[PDB]
Amino acid sequence: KIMEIKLIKGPKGLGFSIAGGVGNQHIPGDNSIYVTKIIEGGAAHKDGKLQIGDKLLAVNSVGLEEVTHEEAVTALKNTSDFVYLKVAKPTSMYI
């Protein structure tokens, strides 16, 4: 299930780590970007909605679907302080 998350970029960024990307599949057969860690005190932690396992779809107007890992790293580092983060919650269990 798809949700939009509103984040202010903190001094250290959005407060979460990612894996995946085209050429760097986190899940076998999935080129998607996944949340692997939520940083305590971070903007993502404090908001409360983003979780380990979430799939990133977009960051503001930047698509994260079928992008390489470096592309998503850049998307997330170089956004505005006002972030709309679109994510999909897992159907199965994990990531």
UniProtKB/Swiss-Prot annotation:
It is found in: Cell membrane; Basolateral cell membrane; Endoplasmic reticulum membrane; Postsynaptic density. Residues 4-90 form the PDZ domain. Phosphorylated by MAPK12. Ubiquitinated; by MARCHF2 which results in its degradation. It comes from the Eukaryota. Transmembrane segments: none annotated. Widely expressed. Strongly expressed in epithelial cells, in the small intestine it is only detected in the vili. Expressed in brain, heart (at protein level), muscle, lung and liver. In the brain it was detected in olfactory bulbs, cerebral cortex, hippocampus, and spinal cord (at protein level). The modification Phosphotyrosine is found at residue 84. Induction: By BDNF. Homotetramer. Interacts (via guanylate kinase-like domain) with DLGAP1, DLGAP2, DLGAP3, DLGAP4 and MAP1A. Interacts (via guanylate kinase-like domain) with KIF13B. May interact with HTR2A. Interacts (via PDZ domains) with GRIA1. Interacts (via PDZ domains) with GRIN2A. Interacts (via PDZ domains) with KCND2 and KCND3. Interacts (via PDZ domains) with KCNA1, KCNA2, KCNA3 and KCNA4. Interacts (via PDZ domains) with ADGRA3. Interacts with KCNF1. Interacts with CAMK2. Interacts with cytoskeleton-associated protein EPB41. Interacts with cytoskeleton-associated protein EZR. The PDZ domains may also mediate association to membranes by binding to EPB41 and ADGRA2 together with the L27 domain that binds CASK and DLG2. Essential multidomain scaffolding protein required for normal development. Recruits channels, receptors and signaling molecules to discrete plasma membrane domains in polarized cells. Promotes epithelial cell layer barrier function via maintaining cell-cell adhesion. May play a role in adherens junction assembly, signal transduction, cell proliferation, synaptogenesis and lymphocyte activation. Regulates the excitability of cardiac myocytes by modulating the functional expression of Kv4 channels. Functional regulator of Kv1.5 channel. Belongs to the MAGUK family. This is Disks large homolog 1. The gene is Dlg1. The chain holds residues 315 to 409 of 911 of the full protein.
